[PDB]
Ligand binder design. Structure first.
Ligand SMILES: CC(C)[C@H](N)C(=O)NC[C@H](CCC[B-](O)(O)O)[C@H](N)C(=O)O
Ligand SMILES: CC(C)[C@H](N)C(=O)NC[C@H](CCC[B-](O)(O)O)[C@H](N)C(=O)O
Ligand SMILES: [Mn+2]
Ligand SMILES: [Mn+2]
Ligand SMILES: [Mn+2]
Ligand SMILES: [Mn+2]
Ligand SMILES: [Mn+2]
Ligand SMILES: [Mn+2]
Lengths: 318, 323, 318
């Protein structure tokens, strides 16, 4: 039995493509609560947060898009996550764009000083506000959280409340295939361990999971924050997303990551972001992405491919 | 072509069962595999073919449901009694018996008939374990229960169903290996674990890789001694993207390459003695190409089990023509 | 920095399915030049070559279709390829059917007698004009180039210029899944090493690339000719091709082949053949194939999935 909290974060200001705000609804309609209930999860539904809108939040330094709104929505989310984690719940957040991990990791770190992060994504999301080319904050969340990058990060409007809470040795990336040159330098320079699609092609998903846990929890037990962007999966499996990159995780690899995260017993928070149902060419393609999102969450809380979750005690006798 | 690396004597039996489940159209499965060019493909591999044709199945008039759950028990048990005779005949005559399905309840018949080869072993390729007892099942569909009737160790948990008195448990727990499991019922999981039935789920394939899965499968089954092999292949073991024309599809299945690899490894043992190719249902496909792709894939599995390979080399070439 | 010459060879006469001539255009329209420019490549586009047409071209031995048209266009291509290799450039030939490899490998071997070939295809393309059943020359290019096969190859009209240059030990195949009985006989009896889809299933693409280079460049460094048939990829990824065969390379395996070729620093010439935009059922299937062809060429010239192709060594400070 797991105590699990669920938070809806209908936020899109971390990027330019509209519809990602409908992400939490699409995941709920796909039957998330029912699936978590069937696994025996003691649930708490915090509903879908209404983020305080910012009227004056124009382009900053001809680069950064909506900084005030992103910083604000994330401060609000950080409080709700803090509450869920302090109440003793494993915190599930439904996105919304990936800028929301600023809020979810900040909130979770308020209670876990030794938290580690498993970041499952096609992208590194580690551009600083000076290295970014798009200026979209969904490509920058990790720069505000990493301690080693504080001196390389300018203070943005609405971002005063963030305190870096994770060290470079405490985050492992899985699924990378679209990394900006400044992001590649950051990962290499600061010894941030990653397993790109190329690493998985060579090692395979089993050794990748073994080496991830070896790096993070090999010396001691630690709470795990799984930050999962749906674009980590191939766009054939997850088409309803803003930044799709071909050559992604298969359905089996993705279930494997979630299953292995469940088996540690250390899962403490999970973000499931970037599901944009409006970006799918048909209704069933939007529905496939949403159902895939539920499978990741369910497998992260016990759903297995061997049917061993619901325990059978005795076979009836004739 | 006149030369081949091997010459196989293959018996083909069409078993269009449907009473082992409730989805209509699986009875058109043997016809779909035939239409996709099965006989021609086996001949192109230098097989000596004995086509036993498509078997006729007549349902029992007063076939009442056992414990108000188990649908068509007598019709399923009797059809399997008849199927078991044809399979025993084909194997006794020296043929590798290929049975086209039809739903997976037909394996009660093919395995029972085959065993009449007592030291046989079963390789069960499926998304499902089909090991529910008549008491543990929730659907009542007998295609989800065939292994329960065949296992010696399960006999005490299996009630004597009407039309099933003829069946004698022929295979022990240690003589059946599953491959592709991804939709296991909680009572099935209990049986597999408590009876020590070895399986390789989609998760084990994810970890080990299909090569290690086949090596370990043969170590467990034919490692101690050379034994005839019964390959019972449910098409739902493949991903619905590759095999959509099926009754119970489950996402995250075998890739085309994995399925061909299993079949080629089965051929390389030189021990295939009977093969079931079940659960092709052309009606359940949204399009003709989807139904044809499933039927074509079924032909590829059967052909690879009798020598067809990715590299070629099944057909022996003499010399190159000189100018 | 890589000097790269792009030769559009709009061939079609090596087979019967019309539309493959519009392949170089489809690859260019998929942003090939923009992509290679962003890799820091010094580019020369020869555009689409206009091959001299042969109006009177009768079938040889009532089987071999269009032999003079194929033999001449390949002689014209070998001159251009020899000039590009001469001018310092790494030669990229856009197809067009695979018979154009007769020209590209011919031209290239004039300046690189020690070249080795990595043939990436669903097929072995090694039928002699006496073993072929189709009569399509795109299924025979390797017979004419292979030294050890000279006594089994008859002199075709407009094929006298061809000097067999590659030895059996200097060609390795990758991706083989549809091999004719005479083609299998040639491979085994002449000791031509290959990695079928089955060898890939067992070894994995990493070990395949390792063994490929051990056979070819294990004794010394040599120039590499990468002849890449788009049909080596599963038809789900590469549908707009003439001869599709199920159970091919995934996108990831294909990128890995290309990345490993790049990592040698020995790529001297590359063929990207058999993209036929006409054979796609929809506009997205034609663009998917063309985008895939651009990804292969780009990865063979440095494009990575980790992002370390561009030099970056200083982070901006606020
Ligand atoms: C340059 C683009 C056309 C390119 N193909 C891309 O995917 N760009 C988005 C990246 C961020 C993706 C945020 B995520 O989805 O992971 O949450 C980028 N590195 C950034 O900084 O804008
Ligand atoms: C006969 C077909 C159904 C069959 N499955 C096939 O693909 N046939 C083409 C082969 C040639 C492939 C040239 B390539 O695209 O690689 O460049 C063949 N071996 C030949 O010689 O015609
Ligand atoms: Mn992201
Ligand atoms: Mn992403
Ligand atoms: Mn079955
Ligand atoms: Mn099944
Ligand atoms: Mn080919
Ligand atoms: Mn080819």
């Amino acid at each position: 039995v797991h105590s699990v909290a669920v938070i809806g974060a209908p936020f899109s200001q971390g990027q330019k493509r509209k519809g990602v705000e409908h992400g939490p609804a699409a995941i709920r309609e796909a039957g998330l609560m029912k699936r978590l209930s069937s696994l025996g999860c003691h649930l708490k539904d915090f509903g879908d947060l209404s983020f305080t809108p910012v009227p004056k939040d124009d382009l900053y330094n001809n680069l950064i898009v909506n900084p005030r709104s992103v910083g604000l929505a994330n401060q609000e989310l950080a409080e709700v996550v803090s509450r869920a984690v302090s109440d003793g719940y494993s915190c599930v957040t439904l996105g919304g764009d990936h800028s929301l991990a600023i809020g979810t990791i900040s909130g979770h770190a308020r209670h876990c000083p030794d938290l580690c992060v498993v970041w499952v994504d096609a992208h590194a999301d580690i551009n600083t506000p000076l290295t970014t080319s798009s200026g979209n904050l969904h490509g920058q969340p990790v720069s505000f959280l990493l301690r080693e990058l504080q001196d390389k990060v300018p203070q943005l409007p609405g971002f005063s409340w963030i305190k870096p809470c994770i060290s470079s040795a405490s985050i492992v990336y899985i699924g990378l295939r679209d990394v900006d040159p400044p992001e590649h330098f950051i990962l290499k320079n600061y010894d941030i361990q990653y397993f790109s699609m190329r690493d998985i092609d060579r090692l395979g998903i089993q050794k990748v999971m073994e080496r991830t846990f070896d790096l993070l929890i090999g010396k001691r037990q630690r709470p795990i924050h799984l930050s999962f962007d749906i674009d980590a999966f191939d766009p054939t499996l997850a088409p309803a997303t803003g930044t799709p990159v071909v050559g992604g995780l298969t359905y089996r690899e993705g279930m494997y990551i979630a299953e292995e995260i469940h088996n540690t017993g250390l899962l403490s928070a999970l973000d499931l972001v970037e599901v944009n149902p409006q970006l799918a060419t048909s209704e069933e393609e939007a529905k496939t992405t949403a159902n895939l999102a539920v499978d990741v969450i369910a497998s992260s809380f016990g759903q297995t491919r061997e049917g061993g979750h619901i325990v059978y005690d005795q076979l009836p006798t004739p």
